[PDB]
Amino acid sequence: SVDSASKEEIAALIVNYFSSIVEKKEISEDGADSLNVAMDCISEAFGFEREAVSGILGKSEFKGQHLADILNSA
Amino acid sequence: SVDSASKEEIAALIVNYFSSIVEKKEISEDGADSLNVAMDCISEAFGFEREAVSGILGKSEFKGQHLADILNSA
Amino acid sequence: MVHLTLKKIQAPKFSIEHDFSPSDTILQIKQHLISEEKASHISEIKLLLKGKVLHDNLFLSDLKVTPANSTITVMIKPNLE
Numbered sequence: 001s002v003d004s005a006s007k008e009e010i011a012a013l014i015v016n017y018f019s020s021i022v023e024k025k026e027i028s029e030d031g032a033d034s035l036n037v038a039m040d041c042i043s044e045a046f047g048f049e050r051e052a053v054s055g056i057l058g059k060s061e062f063k064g065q066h067l068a069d070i071l072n073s074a
Numbered sequence: 075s076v077d078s079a080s081k082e083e084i085a086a087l088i089v090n091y092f093s094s095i096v097e098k099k100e101i102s103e104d105g106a107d108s109l110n111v112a113m114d115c116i117s118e119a120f121g122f123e124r125e126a127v128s129g130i131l132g133k134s135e136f137k138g139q140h141l142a143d144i145l146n147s148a
Numbered sequence: 149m150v151h152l153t154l155k156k157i158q159a160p161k162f163s164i165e166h167d168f169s170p171s172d173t174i175l176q177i178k179q180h181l182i183s184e185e186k187a188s189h190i191s192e193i194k195l196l197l198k199g200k201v202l203h204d205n206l207f208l209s210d211l212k213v214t215p216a217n218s219t220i221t222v223m224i225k226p227n228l229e
Binding site: 003005007010013014016017019020021026027028031034035037038041042044045046053054055057058059060064066067068070071072073074 | 077079081084087088090091093094095100101102104105108109112115116118119120127128129131132133134136138140141142143144145146147
Binding site: 030034037040041044 | 158194196201223225
């Protein structure tokens with residue numbers, strides 16, 4: 001409903017996160033590979049470049065307000 | 075650097091956001107298809123189900139501070 | 149025969165339907181893509197099955213082709229400029 005999270009923000013966050021994850025290898029070998037390939041396809045899906053992260057997100061405190069109306073937390 | 079975010083949370087946020095993206099169809103049909111296959115890919119990578127998003131994210135303010143060392147925001 | 153629908157998202161994209169053997173290798177699929185001028189090298193190809201990842205020397209009886217899907221997502225990186 002009140003989700004103020006922009007798709008471009010999330011998309012850039014996904015590729016940004018994945019890249020930093022493979023950077024320190026904070027996941028299984030094929031896991032990292034899967035994240036990389038998914039990242040590539042996701043970038044294509046949103047028609048943006050994985051390297052555009054700093055352009056979309058930057059450091060303006062990207063608060064991806066997306067609750068998806070989930071009140072079933074517990 | 076001081077990335078105070080858990081990969082689990084992020085993973086759940088991705089699959090959660092993706093679900094809402096195909097929900098209102100805020101992306102192309104082919105794009106939705108791509109996000110749907112990627113969804114299970116990321117879910118499989120972390121060994122978690124997209125159905126557990128609520129228990130992970132909830133609504134306790136998911137402050138996933140992940141700068142990813144981005145200083146080229148200019 | 150097992151029904152496998154090859155769905156390539158990235159360019160060049162395509163969606164071909166073919167029948168493979170239960171003991172068939174993913175390598176055969178990769179080679180077929182190259183032979184059809186749709187892929188550059190097997191090394192740059194990865195098949196996706198509803199999240200489930202496939203390997204080069206993997207067999208259909210190993211990964212288990214889910215009947216509820218039968219859709220294989222093709223991911224290829226073009227080496228040709």
